[PDB]
Amino acid sequence: AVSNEEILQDPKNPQQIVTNGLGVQGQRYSPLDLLNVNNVKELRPVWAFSFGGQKQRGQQAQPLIKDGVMYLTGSYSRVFAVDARTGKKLWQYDARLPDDIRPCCDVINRGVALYGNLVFFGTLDAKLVALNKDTGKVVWSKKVADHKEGYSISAAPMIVNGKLITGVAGGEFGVVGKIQAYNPENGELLWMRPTVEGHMGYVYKDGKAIENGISGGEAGKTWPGDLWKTGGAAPWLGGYYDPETNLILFGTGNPAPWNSHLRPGDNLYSSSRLALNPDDGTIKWHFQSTPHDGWDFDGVNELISFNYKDGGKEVKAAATADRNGFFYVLDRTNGKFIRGFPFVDKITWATGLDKDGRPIYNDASRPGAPGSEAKGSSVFVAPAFLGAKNWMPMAYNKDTGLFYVPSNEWGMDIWNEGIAYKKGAAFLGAGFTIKPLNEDYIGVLRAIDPVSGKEVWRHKNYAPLWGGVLTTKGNLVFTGTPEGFLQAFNAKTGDKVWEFQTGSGVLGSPVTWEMDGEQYVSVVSGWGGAVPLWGGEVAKRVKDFNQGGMLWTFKLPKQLQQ
Ligand SMILES: O=C(O)c1cc(C(=O)O)c2c(n1)C(=O)C(=O)c1cc(C(=O)O)[nH]c1-2
Ligand SMILES: [Pr+3]
Numbered sequence: 103a104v105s106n107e108e109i110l111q112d113p114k115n116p117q118q119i120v121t122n123g124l125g126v127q128g129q130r131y132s133p134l135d136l137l138n139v140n141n142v143k144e145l146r147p148v149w150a151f152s153f154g155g156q157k158q159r160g161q162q163a164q165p166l167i168k169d170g171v172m173y174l175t176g177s178y179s180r181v182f183a184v185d186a187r188t189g190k191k192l193w194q195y196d197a198r199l200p201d202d203i204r205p206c207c208d209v210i211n212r213g214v215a216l217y218g219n220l221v222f223f224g225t226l227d228a229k230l231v232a233l234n235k236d237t238g239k240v241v242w243s244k245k246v247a248d249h250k251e252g253y254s255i256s257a258a259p260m261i262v263n264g265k266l267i268t269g270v271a272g273g274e275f276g277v278v279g280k281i282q283a284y285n286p287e288n289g290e291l292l293w294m295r296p297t298v299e300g301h302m303g304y305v306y307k308d309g310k311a312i313e314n315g316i317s318g319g320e321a322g323k324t325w326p327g328d329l330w331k332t333g334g335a336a337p338w339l340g341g342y343y344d345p346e347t348n349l350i351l352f353g354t355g356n357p358a359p360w361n362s363h364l365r366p367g368d369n370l371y372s373s374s375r376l377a378l379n380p381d382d383g384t385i386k387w388h389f390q391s392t393p394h395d396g397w398d399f400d401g402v403n404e405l406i407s408f409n410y411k412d413g414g415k416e417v418k419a420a421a422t423a424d425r426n427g428f429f430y431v432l433d434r435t436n437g438k439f440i441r442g443f444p445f446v447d448k449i450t451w452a453t454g455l456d457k458d459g460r461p462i463y464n465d466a467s468r469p470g471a472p473g474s475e476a477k478g479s480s481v482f483v484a485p486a487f488l489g490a491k492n493w494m495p496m497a498y499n500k501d502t503g504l505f506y507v508p509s510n511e512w513g514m515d516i517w518n519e520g521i522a523y524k525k526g527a528a529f530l531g532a533g534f535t536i537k538p539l540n541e542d543y544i545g546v547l548r549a550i551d552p553v554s555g556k557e558v559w560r561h562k563n564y565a566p567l568w569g570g571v572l573t574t575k576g577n578l579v580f581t582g583t584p585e586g587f588l589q590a591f592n593a594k595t596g597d598k599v600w601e602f603q604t605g606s607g608v609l610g611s612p613v614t615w616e617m618d619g620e621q622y623v624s625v626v627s628g629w630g631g632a633v634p635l636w637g638g639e640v641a642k643r644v645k646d647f648n649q650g651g652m653l654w655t656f657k658l659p660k661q662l663q664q
Pocket of ligand 2: 273355356400
């Protein structure tokens with residue numbers, strides 16, 4: 103019972119959230135203001151739901167809520183339907199996963215999509231699955247790609263113009279990134295668009311694949327030899343959609359392998375934002391945040407549409423806080439650079455951006471080629487490869503006009519080494535040790551003014567931040583910490599105003615909605631993601647943080663709202 107018009111209305115309908123991002127553009131802003139700075143002290147848990155299964159690790163889903171039912175995912179490719187008022191389980195789906203799944207960075211999943219009477223998600227063995235919303239039974243399932251080649255799916259899918267769209271993950275395994283659209287009712291493939299230059303995209307008619315242009319025009323333009331055949335650029339975070347331009351905005355992963363000396367050239371369209379026509383999957387513009395990446399600065403971070411006025415002129419902008427440390431503002435009609443500026447305190451790999459938004463590189467900050475030695479020169483780089491920001495989404499508050507960015511301050515030793523591609527094996531060619539830049543903190547929640555290019559406030563956290571952000575009309579900003587708290591801040595000042603210890607690190611993007619005249623807030627908890635196994639010295643800071651796997655639901659009682 104979810105229509106396309108309903109999806110386009112988010113977040114206008116107080117009783118439901120039927121999109122990842124609280125609206126197709128991903129602003130993560132709720133217009134609800136029952137809960138505000140003056141009464142958030144009365145917010146308290148009303149029920150919780152354990153995922154069980156002795157299957158914990160990272161829990162990254164944002165729940166969707168429709169007809170009083172919450173739909174969410176868990177680690178290890180599970181889907182739950184849970185009564186929003188009581189926490190009672192309606193049904194649960196556990197995907198059968200093979201023992202040789204190949205996620206780089208934990209067995210995470212970022213959520214479902216809803217359309218008609220179906221619930222959709224992608225699995226860690228790279229299937230797209232449609233479940234009956236009432237029974238949880240499989241209605242259809244399609245292989246998106248071959249998990250034995252290193253493909254997985256970790257992102258929430260999206261609905262655009264009645265089409266179900268998913269990317270894939272696996273750049274650390276040298277997969278070929280691609281975005282796919284499907285008929286939601288039956289799983290019939292509609293189009294496919296590779297994100298690596300040189301690969302043919304297709305539309306599908308009557309079950310037949312019809313050529314629809316090579317991504318980037320021709321193979322070998324910004325890649326040498328056949329390196330583009332394992333180029334990565336996986337669009338592993340999903341994307342968002344702008345109704346005004348009718349463009350899907352999708353970011354792409356790092357180029358493979360990590361050893362950039364094996365792939366001279368800009369390596370399109372790795373570490374880029376793409377705008378695609380949803381009719382047929384053609385790329386209408388691109389912006390490359392890190393050309394010829396040498397640091398695993400994936401360019402997937404969400405590109406969030408927002409409008410403002412400059413010289414009395416209306417600007418259709420979009421903002422993204424990149425892995426590489428720069429906060430970019432683009433003209434979303436054509437992809438042209440408006441402004442870009444650091445949102446972390448230390449960047450070594452570039453000294454700035456040129457007039458088109460291309461980095462001005464500091465070549466001493468790229469690890470050298472191994473040459474005659476086993477390893478090349480080690481260099482210290484900031485940000486670390488895990489990024490100034492990683493998967494976890496920022497939020498836009500329409501009232502303050504600010505973006506609220508969960509950022510991290512860390513650097514890395516990094517070196518390069520030879521690497522031969524082997525199907526299904528890691529495809530790095532680099533070694534590394536992530537290190538803190540500061541003794542007392544790593545994570546920094548930052549309010550960014552995207553028009554002035556200024557930081558408005560900052561809040562430091564001992565552990566890295568690794569969770570999505572929510573902001574509301576009640577002048578509130580919510581986000582989780584690995585220390586286990588769901589935390590709320592004053593959106594104007596950054597002062598903490600509320601928190602609750604959920605008992606395991608909180609990664610989920612919080613969501614809020616209204617039922618029976620009361621405002622609810624929900625988040626999933628369960629520590630994991632890339633930091634424990636990729637985090638180097640910083641992982642040691644959080645080594646004693648226990649796993650979990652639980653949906654938490656809070657409410658402001660009606661009689662305490664005034
Ligand atoms: O290049 C890729 O295809 C890909 C996928 C993922 C993923 O699917 O989650 C991550 C990364 N890269 C990555 O570079 C990274 O730091 C990362 C962190 C996480 C996480 O969920 O904590 N996933 C990923
Ligand atoms: Pr990557």
